[PDB]
Amino acid sequence: PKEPEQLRKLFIGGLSFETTDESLRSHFEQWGTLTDCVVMRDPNTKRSRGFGFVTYATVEEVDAAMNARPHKVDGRVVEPKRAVSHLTVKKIFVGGIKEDTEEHHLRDYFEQYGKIEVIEIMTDRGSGKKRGFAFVTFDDHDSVDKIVIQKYHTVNGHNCEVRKAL
Ligand SMILES: CCC(=O)Nc1cccc(N)c1C
Numbered sequence: 001p002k003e004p005e006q007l008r009k010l011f012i013g014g015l016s017f018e019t020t021d022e023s024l025r026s027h028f029e030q031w032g033t034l035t036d037c038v039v040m041r042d043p044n045t046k047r048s049r050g051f052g053f054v055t056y057a058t059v060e061e062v063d064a065a066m067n068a069r070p071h072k073v074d075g076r077v078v079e080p081k082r083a084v085s086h087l088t089v090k091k092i093f094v095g096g097i098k099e100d101t102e103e104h105h106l107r108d109y110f111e112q113y114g115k116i117e118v119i120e121i122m123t124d125r126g127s128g129k130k131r132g133f134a135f136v137t138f139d140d141h142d143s144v145d146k147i148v149i150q151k152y153h154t155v156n157g158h159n160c161e162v163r164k165a166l
């Protein structure tokens with residue numbers, strides 16, 4: 001039961017034009033087994049396009065690589081991002097939390113995806129009653145990228161709808 005390959009890929013932007021399949025692989029093999037590693041090049045000149053992708057054997061390895069950012073590859077800090085499900089944001093909408101979900105429920109759950117900077121539990125402008133949804137802002141986009149590819153989110157017993165926000 002191998003995780004889908006799309007969820008094991010990291011797109012690496014900002015490459016040095018000197019980076020090769022081999023040097024990209026040598027770098028990212030520090031955090032797991034790479035089943036694929038390619039630097040994108042022009043079909044005619046073979047000059048690097050400045051980006052490429054690596055595929056790990058497992059999702060846990062993708063996490064390890066993301067948690068080892070910043071990555072300086074061949075002298076240049078690169079920009080790894082998980083493959084598209086790129087709309088790169090740090091904020092999520094959390095819906096379906098009803099009136100009884102509080103800040104600590106959302107924090108205790110989502111803090112295991114990344115570092116939380118803001119939790120905004122939405123209330124009615126007129127009555128102050130909870131509206132049943134919230135926004136969570138993290139310090140970095142990978143948290144959000146991990147969150148929105150999950151099929152399910154269970155918080156405070158509620159089955160929640162979670163999507164990228166703005
Ligand atoms: C940093 C060196 C570099 O850009 N390499 C390069 C330049 C022009 C053509 C081709 N094919 C290649 C590999």
Ligand SMILES: CCC(=O)Nc1cccc(N)c1C
Pocket residue numbers: 063064067111112113114115
């Ligand atoms: C496996 C990924 C993981 O545990 N989550 C993570 C990664 C990086 C920063 C922070 N704060 C957190 C909670």
